[PDB]
mmCIF file of N, CA and C in Angstrom:
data_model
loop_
_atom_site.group_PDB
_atom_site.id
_atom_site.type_symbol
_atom_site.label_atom_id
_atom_site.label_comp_id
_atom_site.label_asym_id
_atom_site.label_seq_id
_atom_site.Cartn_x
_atom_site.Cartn_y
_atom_site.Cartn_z
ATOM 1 N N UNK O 6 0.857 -1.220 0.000
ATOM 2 C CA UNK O 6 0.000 0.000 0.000
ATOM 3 C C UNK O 6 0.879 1.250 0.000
ATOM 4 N N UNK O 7 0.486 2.107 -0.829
ATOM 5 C CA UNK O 7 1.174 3.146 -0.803
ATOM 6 C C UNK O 7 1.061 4.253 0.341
ATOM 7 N N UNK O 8 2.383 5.266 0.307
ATOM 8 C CA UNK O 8 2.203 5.458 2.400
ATOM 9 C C UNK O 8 3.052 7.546 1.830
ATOM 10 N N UNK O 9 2.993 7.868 2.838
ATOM 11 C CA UNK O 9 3.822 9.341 3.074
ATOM 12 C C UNK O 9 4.958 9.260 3.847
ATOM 13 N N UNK O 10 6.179 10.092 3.751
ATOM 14 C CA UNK O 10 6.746 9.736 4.243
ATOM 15 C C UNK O 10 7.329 10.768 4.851
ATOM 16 N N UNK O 11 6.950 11.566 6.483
ATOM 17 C CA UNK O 11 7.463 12.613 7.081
ATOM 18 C C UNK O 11 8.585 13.256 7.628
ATOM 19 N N UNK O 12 8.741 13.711 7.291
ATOM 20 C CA UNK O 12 10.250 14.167 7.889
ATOM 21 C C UNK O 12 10.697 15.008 9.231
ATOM 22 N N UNK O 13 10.328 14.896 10.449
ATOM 23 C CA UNK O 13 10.592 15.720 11.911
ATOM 24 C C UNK O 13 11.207 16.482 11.693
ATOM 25 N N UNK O 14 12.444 16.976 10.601
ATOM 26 C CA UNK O 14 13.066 17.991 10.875
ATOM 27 C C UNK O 14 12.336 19.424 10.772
ATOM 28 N N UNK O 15 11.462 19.170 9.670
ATOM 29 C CA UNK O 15 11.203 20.290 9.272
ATOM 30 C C UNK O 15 9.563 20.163 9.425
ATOM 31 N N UNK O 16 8.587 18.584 9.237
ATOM 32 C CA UNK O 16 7.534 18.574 9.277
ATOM 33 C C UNK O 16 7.086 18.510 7.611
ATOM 34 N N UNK O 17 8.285 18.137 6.790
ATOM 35 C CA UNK O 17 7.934 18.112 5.456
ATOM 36 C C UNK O 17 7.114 16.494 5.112
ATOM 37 N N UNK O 18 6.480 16.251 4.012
ATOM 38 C CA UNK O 18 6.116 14.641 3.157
ATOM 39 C C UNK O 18 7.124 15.123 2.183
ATOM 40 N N UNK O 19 7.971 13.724 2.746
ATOM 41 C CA UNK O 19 9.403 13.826 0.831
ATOM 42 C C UNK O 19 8.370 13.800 0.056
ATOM 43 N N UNK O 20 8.737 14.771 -1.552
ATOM 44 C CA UNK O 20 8.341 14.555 -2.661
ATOM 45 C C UNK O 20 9.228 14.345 -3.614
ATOM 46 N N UNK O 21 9.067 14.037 -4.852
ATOM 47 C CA UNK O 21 9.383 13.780 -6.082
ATOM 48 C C UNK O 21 9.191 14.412 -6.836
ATOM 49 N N UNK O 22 9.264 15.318 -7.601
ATOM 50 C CA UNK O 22 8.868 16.515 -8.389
ATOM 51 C C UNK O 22 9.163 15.834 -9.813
ATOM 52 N N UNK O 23 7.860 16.245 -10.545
ATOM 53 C CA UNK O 23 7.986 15.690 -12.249
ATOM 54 C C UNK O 23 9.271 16.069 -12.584
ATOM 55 N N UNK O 24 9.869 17.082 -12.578
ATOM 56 C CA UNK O 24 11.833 17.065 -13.144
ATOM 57 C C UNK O 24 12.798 16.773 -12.864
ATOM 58 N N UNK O 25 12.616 15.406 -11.511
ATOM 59 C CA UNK O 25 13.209 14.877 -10.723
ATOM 60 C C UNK O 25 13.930 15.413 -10.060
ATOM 61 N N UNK O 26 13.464 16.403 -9.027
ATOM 62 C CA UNK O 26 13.951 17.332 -8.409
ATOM 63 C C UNK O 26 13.429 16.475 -6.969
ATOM 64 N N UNK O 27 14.093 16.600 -5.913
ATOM 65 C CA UNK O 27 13.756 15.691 -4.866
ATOM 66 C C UNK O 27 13.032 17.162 -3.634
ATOM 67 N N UNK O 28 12.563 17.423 -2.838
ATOM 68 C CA UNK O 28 12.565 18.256 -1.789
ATOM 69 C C UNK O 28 11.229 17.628 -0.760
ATOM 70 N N UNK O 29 10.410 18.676 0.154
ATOM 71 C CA UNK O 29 9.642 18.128 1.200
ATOM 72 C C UNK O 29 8.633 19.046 0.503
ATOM 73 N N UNK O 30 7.263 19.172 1.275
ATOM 74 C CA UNK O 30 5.968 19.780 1.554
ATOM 75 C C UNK O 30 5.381 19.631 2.488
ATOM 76 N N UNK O 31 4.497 20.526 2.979
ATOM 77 C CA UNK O 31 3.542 20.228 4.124
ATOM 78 C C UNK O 31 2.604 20.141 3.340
ATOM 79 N N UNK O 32 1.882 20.458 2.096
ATOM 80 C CA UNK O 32 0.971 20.344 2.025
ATOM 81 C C UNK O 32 0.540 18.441 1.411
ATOM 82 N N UNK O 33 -0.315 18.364 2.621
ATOM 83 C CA UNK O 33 -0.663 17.010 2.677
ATOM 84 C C UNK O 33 -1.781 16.200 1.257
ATOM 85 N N UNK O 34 -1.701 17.800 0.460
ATOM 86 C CA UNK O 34 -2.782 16.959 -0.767
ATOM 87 C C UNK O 34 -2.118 17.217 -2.009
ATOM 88 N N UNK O 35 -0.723 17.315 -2.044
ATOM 89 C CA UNK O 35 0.340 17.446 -3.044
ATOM 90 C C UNK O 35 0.401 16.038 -3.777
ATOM 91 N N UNK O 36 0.110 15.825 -4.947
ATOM 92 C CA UNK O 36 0.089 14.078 -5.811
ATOM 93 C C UNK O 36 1.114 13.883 -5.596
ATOM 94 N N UNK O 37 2.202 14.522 -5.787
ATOM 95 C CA UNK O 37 4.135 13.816 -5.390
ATOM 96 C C UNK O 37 4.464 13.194 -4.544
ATOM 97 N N UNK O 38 3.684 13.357 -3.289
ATOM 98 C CA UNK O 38 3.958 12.876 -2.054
ATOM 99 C C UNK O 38 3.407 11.273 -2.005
ATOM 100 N N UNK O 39 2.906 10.691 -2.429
ATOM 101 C CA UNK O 39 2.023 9.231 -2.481
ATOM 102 C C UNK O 39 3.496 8.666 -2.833
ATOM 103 N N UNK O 40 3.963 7.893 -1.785
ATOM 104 C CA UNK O 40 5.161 6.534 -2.302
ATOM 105 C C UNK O 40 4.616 5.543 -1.974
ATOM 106 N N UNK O 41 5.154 4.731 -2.815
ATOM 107 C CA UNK O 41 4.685 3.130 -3.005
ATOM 108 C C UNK O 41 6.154 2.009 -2.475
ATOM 109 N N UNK O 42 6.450 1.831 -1.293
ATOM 110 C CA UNK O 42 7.581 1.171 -1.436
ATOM 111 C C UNK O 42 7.318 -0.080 -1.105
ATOM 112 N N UNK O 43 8.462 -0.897 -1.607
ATOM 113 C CA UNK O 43 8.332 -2.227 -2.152
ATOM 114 C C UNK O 43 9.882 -2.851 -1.924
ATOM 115 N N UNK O 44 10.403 -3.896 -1.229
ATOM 116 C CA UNK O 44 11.217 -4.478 -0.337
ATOM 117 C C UNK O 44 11.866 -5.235 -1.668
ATOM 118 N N UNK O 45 12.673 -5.334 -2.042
ATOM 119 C CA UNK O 45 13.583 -6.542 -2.928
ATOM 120 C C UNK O 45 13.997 -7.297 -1.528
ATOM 121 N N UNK O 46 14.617 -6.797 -0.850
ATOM 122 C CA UNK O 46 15.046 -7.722 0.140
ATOM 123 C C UNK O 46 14.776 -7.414 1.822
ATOM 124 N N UNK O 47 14.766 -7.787 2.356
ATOM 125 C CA UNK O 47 14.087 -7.542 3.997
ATOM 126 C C UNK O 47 15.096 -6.461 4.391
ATOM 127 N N UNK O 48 14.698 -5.330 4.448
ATOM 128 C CA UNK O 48 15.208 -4.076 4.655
ATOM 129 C C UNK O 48 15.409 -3.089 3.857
ATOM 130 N N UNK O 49 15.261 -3.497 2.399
ATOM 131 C CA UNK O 49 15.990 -2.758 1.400
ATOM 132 C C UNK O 49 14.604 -2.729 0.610
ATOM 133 N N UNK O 50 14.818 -0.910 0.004
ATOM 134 C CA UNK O 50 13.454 -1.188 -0.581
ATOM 135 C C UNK O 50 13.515 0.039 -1.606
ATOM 136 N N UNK O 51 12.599 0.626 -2.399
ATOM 137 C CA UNK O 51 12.311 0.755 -3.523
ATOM 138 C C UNK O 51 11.486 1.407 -3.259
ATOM 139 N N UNK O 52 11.637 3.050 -2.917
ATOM 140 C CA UNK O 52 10.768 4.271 -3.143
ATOM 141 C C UNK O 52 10.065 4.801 -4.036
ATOM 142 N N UNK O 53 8.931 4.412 -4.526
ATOM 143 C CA UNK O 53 8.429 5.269 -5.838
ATOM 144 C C UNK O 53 7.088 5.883 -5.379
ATOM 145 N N UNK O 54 7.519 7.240 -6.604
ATOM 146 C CA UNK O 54 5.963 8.757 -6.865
ATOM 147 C C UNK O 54 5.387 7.467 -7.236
ATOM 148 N N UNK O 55 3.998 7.215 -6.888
ATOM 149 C CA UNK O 55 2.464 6.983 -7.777
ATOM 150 C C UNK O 55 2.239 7.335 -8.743
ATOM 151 N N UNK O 56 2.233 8.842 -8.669
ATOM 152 C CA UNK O 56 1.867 9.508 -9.921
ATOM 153 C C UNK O 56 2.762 9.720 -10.735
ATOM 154 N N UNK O 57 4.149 9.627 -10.587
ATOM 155 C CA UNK O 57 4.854 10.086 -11.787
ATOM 156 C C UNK O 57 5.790 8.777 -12.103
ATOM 157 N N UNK O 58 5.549 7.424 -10.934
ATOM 158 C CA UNK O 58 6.288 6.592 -11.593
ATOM 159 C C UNK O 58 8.018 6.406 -11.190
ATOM 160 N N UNK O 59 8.538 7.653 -10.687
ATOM 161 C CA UNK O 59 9.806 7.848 -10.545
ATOM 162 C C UNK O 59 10.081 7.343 -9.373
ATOM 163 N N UNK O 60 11.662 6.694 -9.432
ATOM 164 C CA UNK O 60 12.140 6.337 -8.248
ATOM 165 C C UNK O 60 12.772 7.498 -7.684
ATOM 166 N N UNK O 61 13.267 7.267 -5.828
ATOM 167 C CA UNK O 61 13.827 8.275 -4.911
ATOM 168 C C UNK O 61 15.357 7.467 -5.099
ATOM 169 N N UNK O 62 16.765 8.332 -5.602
ATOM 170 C CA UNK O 62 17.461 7.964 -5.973
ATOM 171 C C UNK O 62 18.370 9.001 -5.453
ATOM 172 N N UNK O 63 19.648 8.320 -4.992
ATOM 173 C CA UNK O 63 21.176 9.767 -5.086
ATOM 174 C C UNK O 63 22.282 8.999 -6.124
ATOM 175 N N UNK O 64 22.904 10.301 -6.623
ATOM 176 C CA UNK O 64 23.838 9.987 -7.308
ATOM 177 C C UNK O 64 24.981 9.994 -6.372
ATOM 178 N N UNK O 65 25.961 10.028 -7.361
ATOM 179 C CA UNK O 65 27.483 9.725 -6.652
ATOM 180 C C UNK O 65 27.903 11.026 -5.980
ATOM 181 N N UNK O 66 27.616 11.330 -6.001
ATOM 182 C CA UNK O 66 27.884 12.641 -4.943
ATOM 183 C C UNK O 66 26.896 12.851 -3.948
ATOM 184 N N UNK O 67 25.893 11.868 -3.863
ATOM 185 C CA UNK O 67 24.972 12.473 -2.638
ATOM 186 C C UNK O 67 23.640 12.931 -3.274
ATOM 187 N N UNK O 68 23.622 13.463 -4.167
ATOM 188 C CA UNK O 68 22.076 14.544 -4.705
ATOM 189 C C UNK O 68 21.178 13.743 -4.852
ATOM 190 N N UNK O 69 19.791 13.850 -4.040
ATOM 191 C CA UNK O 69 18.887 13.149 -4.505
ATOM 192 C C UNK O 69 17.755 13.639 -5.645
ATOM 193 N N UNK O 70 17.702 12.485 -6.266
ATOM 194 C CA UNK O 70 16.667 12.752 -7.787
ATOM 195 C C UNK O 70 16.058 11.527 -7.547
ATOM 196 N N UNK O 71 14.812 12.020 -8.778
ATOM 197 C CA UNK O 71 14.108 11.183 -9.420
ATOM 198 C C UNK O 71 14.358 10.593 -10.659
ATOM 199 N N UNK O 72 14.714 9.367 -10.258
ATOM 200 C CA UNK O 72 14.566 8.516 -11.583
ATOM 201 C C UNK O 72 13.694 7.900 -12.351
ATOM 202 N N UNK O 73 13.720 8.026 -13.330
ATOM 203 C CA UNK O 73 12.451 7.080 -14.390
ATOM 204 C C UNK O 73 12.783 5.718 -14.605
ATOM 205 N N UNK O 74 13.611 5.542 -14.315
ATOM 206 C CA UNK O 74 14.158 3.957 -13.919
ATOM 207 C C UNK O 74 14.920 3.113 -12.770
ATOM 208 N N UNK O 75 14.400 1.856 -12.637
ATOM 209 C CA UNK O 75 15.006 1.642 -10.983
ATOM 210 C C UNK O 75 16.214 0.805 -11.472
ATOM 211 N N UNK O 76 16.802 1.008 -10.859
ATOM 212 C CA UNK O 76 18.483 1.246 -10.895
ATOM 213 C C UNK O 76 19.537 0.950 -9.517
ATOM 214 N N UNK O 77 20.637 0.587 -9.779
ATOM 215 C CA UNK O 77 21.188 -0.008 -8.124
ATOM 216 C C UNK O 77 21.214 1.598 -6.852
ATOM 217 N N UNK O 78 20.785 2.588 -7.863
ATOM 218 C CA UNK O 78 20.885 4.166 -7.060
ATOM 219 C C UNK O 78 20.107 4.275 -6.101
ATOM 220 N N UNK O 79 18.776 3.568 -6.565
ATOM 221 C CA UNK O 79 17.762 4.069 -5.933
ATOM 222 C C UNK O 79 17.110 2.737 -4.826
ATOM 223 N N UNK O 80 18.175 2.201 -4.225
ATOM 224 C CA UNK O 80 18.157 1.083 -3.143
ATOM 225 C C UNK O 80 18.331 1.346 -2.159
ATOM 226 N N UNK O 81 17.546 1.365 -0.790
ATOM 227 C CA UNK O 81 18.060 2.279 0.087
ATOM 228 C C UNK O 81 17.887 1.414 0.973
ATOM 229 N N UNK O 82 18.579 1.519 2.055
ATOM 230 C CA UNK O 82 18.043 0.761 3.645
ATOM 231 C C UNK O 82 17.356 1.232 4.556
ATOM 232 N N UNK O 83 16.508 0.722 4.762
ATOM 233 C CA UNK O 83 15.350 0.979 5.747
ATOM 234 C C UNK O 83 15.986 0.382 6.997
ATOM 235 N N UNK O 84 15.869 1.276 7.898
ATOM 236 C CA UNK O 84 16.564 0.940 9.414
ATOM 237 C C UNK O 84 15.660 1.815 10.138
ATOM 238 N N UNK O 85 14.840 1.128 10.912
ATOM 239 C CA UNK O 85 14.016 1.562 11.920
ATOM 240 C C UNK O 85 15.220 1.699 13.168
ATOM 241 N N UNK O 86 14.683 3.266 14.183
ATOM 242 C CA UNK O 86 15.714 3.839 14.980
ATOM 243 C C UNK O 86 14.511 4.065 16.260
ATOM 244 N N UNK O 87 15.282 4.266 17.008
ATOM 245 C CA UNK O 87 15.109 4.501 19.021
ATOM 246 C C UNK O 87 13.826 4.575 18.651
ATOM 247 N N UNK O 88 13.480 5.908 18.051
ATOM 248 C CA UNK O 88 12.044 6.583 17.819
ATOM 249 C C UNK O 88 11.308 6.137 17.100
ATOM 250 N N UNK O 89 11.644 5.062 16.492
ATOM 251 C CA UNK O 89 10.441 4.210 15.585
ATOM 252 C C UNK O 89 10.554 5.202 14.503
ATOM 253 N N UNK O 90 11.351 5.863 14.106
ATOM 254 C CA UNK O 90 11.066 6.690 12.939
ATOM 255 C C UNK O 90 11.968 5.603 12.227
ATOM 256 N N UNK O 91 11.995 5.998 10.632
ATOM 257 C CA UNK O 91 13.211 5.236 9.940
ATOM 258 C C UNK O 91 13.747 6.286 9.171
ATOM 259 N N UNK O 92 15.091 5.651 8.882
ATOM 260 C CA UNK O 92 16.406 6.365 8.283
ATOM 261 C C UNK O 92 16.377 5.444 6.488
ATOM 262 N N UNK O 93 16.909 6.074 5.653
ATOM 263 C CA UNK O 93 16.990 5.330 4.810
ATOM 264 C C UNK O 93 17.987 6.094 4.153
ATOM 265 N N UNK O 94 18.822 4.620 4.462
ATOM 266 C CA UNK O 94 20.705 4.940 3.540
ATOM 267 C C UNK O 94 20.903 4.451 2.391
ATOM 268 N N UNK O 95 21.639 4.948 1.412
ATOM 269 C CA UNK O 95 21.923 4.985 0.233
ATOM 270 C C UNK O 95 22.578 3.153 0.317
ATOM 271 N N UNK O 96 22.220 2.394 -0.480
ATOM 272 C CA UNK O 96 22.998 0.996 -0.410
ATOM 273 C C UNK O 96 23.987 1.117 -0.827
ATOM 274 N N UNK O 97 24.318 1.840 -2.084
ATOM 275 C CA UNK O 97 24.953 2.261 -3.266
ATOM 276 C C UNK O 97 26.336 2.781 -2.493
ATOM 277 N N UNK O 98 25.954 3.764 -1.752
ATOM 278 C CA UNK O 98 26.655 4.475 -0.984
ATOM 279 C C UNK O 98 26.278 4.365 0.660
ATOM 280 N N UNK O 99 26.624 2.886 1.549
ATOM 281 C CA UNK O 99 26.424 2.986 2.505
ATOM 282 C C UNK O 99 27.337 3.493 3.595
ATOM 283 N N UNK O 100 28.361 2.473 2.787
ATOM 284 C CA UNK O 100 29.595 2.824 3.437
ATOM 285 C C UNK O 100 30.341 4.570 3.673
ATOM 286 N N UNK O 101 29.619 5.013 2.880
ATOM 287 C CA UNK O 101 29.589 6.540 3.344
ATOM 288 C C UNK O 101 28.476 7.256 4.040
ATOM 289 N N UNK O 102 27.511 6.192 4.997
ATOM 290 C CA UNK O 102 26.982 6.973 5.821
ATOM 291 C C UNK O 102 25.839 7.780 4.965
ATOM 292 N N UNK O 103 25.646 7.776 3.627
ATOM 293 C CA UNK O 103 24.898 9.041 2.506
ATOM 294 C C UNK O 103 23.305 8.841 2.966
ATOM 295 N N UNK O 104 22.525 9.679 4.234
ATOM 296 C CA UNK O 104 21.156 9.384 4.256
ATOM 297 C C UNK O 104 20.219 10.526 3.206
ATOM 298 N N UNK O 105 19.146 9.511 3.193
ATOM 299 C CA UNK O 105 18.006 10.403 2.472
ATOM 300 C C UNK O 105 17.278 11.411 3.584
ATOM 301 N N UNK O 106 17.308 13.087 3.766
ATOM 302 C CA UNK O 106 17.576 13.599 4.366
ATOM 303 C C UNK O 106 16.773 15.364 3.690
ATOM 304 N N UNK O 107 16.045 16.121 4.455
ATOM 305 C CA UNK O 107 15.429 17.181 3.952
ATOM 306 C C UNK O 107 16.048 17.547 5.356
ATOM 307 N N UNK O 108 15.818 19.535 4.985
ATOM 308 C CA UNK O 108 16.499 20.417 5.596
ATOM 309 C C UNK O 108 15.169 21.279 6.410
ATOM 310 N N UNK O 109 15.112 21.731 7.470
ATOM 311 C CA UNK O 109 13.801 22.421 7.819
ATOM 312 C C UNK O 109 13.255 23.157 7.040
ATOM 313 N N UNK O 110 14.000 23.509 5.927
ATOM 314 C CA UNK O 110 13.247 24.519 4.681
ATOM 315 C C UNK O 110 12.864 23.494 3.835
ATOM 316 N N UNK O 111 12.829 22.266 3.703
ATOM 317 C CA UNK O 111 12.417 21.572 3.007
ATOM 318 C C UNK O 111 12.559 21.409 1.935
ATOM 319 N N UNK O 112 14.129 21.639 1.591
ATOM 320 C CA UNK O 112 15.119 21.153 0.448
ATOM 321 C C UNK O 112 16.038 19.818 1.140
ATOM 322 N N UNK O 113 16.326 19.237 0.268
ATOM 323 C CA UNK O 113 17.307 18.019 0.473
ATOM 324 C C UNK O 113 18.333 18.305 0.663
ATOM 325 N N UNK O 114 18.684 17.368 1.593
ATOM 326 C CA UNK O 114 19.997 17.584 2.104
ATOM 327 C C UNK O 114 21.340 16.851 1.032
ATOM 328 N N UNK O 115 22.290 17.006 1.321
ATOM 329 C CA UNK O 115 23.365 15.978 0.250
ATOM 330 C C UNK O 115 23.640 15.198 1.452
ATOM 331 N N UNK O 116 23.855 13.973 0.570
ATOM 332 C CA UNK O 116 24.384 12.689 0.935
ATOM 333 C C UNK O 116 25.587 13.127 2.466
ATOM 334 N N UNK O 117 26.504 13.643 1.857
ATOM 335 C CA UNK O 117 27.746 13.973 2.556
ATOM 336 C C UNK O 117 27.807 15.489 3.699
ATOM 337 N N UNK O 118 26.263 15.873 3.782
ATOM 338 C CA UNK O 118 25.901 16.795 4.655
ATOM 339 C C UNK O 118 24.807 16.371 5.716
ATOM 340 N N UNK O 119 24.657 14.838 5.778
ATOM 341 C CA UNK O 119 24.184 14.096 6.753
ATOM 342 C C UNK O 119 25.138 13.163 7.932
ATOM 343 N N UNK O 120 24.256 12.560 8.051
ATOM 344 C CA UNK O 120 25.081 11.418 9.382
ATOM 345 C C UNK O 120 24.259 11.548 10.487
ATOM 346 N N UNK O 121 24.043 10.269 11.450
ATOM 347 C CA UNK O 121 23.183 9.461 12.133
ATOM 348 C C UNK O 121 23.287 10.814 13.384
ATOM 349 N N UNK O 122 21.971 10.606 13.661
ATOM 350 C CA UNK O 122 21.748 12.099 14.748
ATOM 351 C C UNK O 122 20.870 12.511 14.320
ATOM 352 N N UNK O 123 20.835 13.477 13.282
ATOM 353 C CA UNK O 123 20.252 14.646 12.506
ATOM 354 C C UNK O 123 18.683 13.980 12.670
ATOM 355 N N UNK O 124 18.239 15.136 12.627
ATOM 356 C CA UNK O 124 16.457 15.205 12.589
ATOM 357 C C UNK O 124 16.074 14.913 11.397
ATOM 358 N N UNK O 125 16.988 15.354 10.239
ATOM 359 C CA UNK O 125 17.331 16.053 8.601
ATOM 360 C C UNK O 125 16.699 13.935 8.115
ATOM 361 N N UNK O 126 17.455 13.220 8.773
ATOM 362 C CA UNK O 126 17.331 11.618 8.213
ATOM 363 C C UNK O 126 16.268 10.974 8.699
ATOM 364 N N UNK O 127 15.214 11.218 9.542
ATOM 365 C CA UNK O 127 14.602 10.500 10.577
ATOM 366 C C UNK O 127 13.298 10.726 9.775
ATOM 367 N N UNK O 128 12.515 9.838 8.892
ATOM 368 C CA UNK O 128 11.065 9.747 8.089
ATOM 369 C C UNK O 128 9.971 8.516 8.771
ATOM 370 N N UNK O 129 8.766 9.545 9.149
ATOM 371 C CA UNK O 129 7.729 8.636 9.555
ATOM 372 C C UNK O 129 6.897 7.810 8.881
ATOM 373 N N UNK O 130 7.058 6.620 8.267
ATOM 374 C CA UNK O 130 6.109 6.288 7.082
ATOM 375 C C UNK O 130 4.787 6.303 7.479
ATOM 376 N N UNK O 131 3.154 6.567 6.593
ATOM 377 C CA UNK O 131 2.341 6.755 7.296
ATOM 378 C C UNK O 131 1.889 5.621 5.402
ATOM 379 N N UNK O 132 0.882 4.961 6.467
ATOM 380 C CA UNK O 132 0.244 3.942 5.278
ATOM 381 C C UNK O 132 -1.022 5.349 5.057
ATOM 382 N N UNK O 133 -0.987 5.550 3.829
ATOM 383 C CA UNK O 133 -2.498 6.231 3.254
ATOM 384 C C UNK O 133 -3.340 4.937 3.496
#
């Protein structure tokens, strides 16, 4: 079932923007915000817009986009934390710590301007 996915730092739902532009919203009736994720393997899973189809993806430097295709980028780890919130790290790039991560203004953070702590990594999934 497809779910929202909140962010405490700022109070944003990650979105996906049709030009694969990654950032947050509050507004709770934004179509971008509907993700559908889906597990390849017990922990690891597969973020996608509803409506636009695109995966939640970082490149090699950290930047998160939307992709129109799923790809080893857009694999992330789901790690439920203290707070029952979850973190979700780049697989691609774990070993560098790279979380998926919005800023209280509700732009994305880079890969390499995160790390375990931050409010910026901590997403509440909510089943619609």
């Amino acid at each position: 079932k497809p779910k929202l996915l909140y962010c405490s730092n700022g109070g944003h739902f990650l979105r996906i923007l049709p030009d694969g532009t990654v950032d947050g919203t509050r507004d709770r009736s934004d179509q971008h915000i509907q993700l559908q994720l889906s597990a390849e393997s017990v922990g690891e899973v597969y973020i996608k817009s509803t409506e636009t189809g695109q995966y939640l993806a970082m490149d090699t430097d950290g930047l998160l986009y939307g992709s129109q295709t799923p790809n080893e980028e857009c694999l992330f780890l789901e790690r439920l934390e203290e707070n029952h919130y979850n973190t979700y790290i780049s697989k691609k790039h774990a070993e560098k710590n790279w979380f998926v991560g919005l800023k209280k203004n509700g732009s994305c953070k880079r890969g390499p301007r995160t790390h375990y702590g931050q409010k910026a990594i901590l997403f509440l999934p909510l089943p619609v």
